[PDB]
Write a protein that binds this ligand. Structure first.
Ligand SMILES: N#Cc1ccc(COC[C@H]2O[C@@H](n3c(NCc4ccc(Cl)c(Cl)c4)nc4c(N)ncnc43)[C@H](O)[C@@H]2O)cc1
Ligand SMILES: [Mg+2]
Length: 382
């Protein structure tokens, strides 16, 4: 009946699925060979739905009908101030329907359709379910799904509802920082500890203070920045190169959406290289007006352009400690989650804040949450 329960991190920008099979957690790659699937859905004018990288890669060509960031809207009402602010930054249409922010898209043949946020998340969960079934060689009916620790009752229920729509019985809703702590085996220890989970992803920043007492977790405080992540650091670098190009050539490349997207792709790759080396060459064939682009970005320049944003991650950490009535020295483990925690300056700032205390390392920060969800899914599969 419940079979092999899957563990899914349903992220704002990226989702990840794991299972417990043959004595260990296995993070599952999708049909594109990727252990992460972008939380994107594109509606083509042929009536087809594209999910994941297939959808993300077609954003520039179909900017009104490619849906992403549905997690920012799920479990909220249309008139929630957070929703009214977020819709200002989203390129697809959002309308009031049944008190909620429904996403409106063209599906071809002169038809437009509206989808609740949980229906978009259900499409992402269906893909995660397909990924898991291809791996296991059998059907998947049950899941453990993670949510941000600050999610309220409506946000947790709407996430279980996205599972129902996808044909998944969401047996447990688990907090993302708790799932990361479980990945590190922090739940399998005698005694009591205070854990700070610092999660800096592609688009969001979450800090959580947890207590662990002989396998029992409590989320004591949460903070962060809802609109700070890796995409913001790429954007600072894009603006930098766009201004330098305008001063050198007198050309504003922002007029050509394709040129901007080629630059975005290469800037993101260069930022990644800058986590292990000190210079990165950005090369673009036929960037603008058919002319090739070839420039270098140093790690020093990358840090300067982003120094305020990197430093900003420190105030939510201090605030969670104040709200927990804990001192820096009371923190027993610092767990880094989210792909942006690979940035050396971010790791430096976290270590400096904690007076030289080394954070927990070793588990891929993009996968730690799904890994913890898979550990719990293994217990439930029996
Ligand atoms: N393949 C793949 C893939 C794996 C994980 C992710 C999730 O990334 C979340 C965020 O994390 C960022 N990030 C990541 N993300 C992981 C990643 C690894 C490989 C690839 Cl091809 C891509 Cl593109 C992304 N690695 C970073 C690094 N070394 N230095 C700085 N930032 C890094 C990334 O730019 C994004 O903003 C996205 C794609
Ligand atoms: Mg995450």
């Amino acid at each position: 009946d419940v079979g092999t329960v899957v563990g899914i991190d349903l992220g704002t920008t990226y989702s990840c699925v794991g299972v417990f099979k043959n004595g260990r957690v296995e993070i599952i790659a999708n049909d594109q060979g990727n252990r992460i699937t972008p939380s994107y859905v594109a509606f083509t004018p042929e009536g087809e739905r594209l999910i994941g990288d297939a959808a993300k890669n077609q954003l520039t060509s179909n900017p009104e009908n490619t849906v992403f960031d549905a997690k920012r809207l799920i479990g909220r009402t249309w008139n929630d101030p957070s929703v009214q602010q977020d819709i200002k930054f989203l390129p697809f249409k959002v309308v009031e329907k049944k008190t909620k922010p429904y996403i409106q898209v063209d599906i071809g043949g002169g038809q437009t359709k509206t989808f609740a946020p949980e229906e978009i998340s259900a499409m992402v969960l269906t893909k995660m379910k397909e990924t898991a079934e291809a791996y296991l060689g059998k059907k998947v009916t049950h899941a453990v799904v993670t949510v941000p620790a600050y999610f309220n009752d409506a946000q947790r229920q709407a996430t279980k509802d996205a599972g129902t729509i996808a044909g998944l019985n969401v047996m447990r809703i688990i907090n993302e920082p708790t799932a990361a702590a479980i990945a590190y085996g922090l739940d399998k220890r005698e005694g009591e500890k205070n854990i700070l989970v610092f999660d800096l992803g592609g688009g969001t920043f979450d800090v959580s203070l947890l207590t662990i007492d002989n396998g029992v977790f409590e989320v004591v405080a949460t903070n962060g920045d809802t609109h700070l992540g890796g995409e913001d650091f790429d954007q600072r670098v894009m603006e930098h190169f766009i201004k330098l190009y305008k001063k050198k050539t007198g050309k504003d490349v922002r007029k050509d959406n394709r040129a901007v997207q080629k630059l975005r792709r290469e800037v993101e790759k260069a930022k990644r290289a800058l986590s292990s080396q000190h210079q990165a060459r950005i090369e673009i064939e036929s960037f603008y007006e058919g002319e090739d682009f070839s420039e270098t970005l140093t790690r020093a320049k990358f840090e300067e352009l982003n120094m305020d944003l990197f430093r900003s991650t420190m105030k939510p950490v201090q605030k969670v400690l104040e709200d927990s009535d804990l001192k820096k020295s009371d923190i027993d483990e610092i767990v880094l989650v989210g792909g942006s925690t690979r940035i050396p300056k971010i790791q430096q700032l976290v270590k400096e804040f904690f007076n030289g205390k080394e954070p927990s390392r070793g588990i891929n920060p993009d996968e730690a949450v799904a890994y913890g969800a898979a550990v719990q899914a293994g217990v439930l599969s029996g």
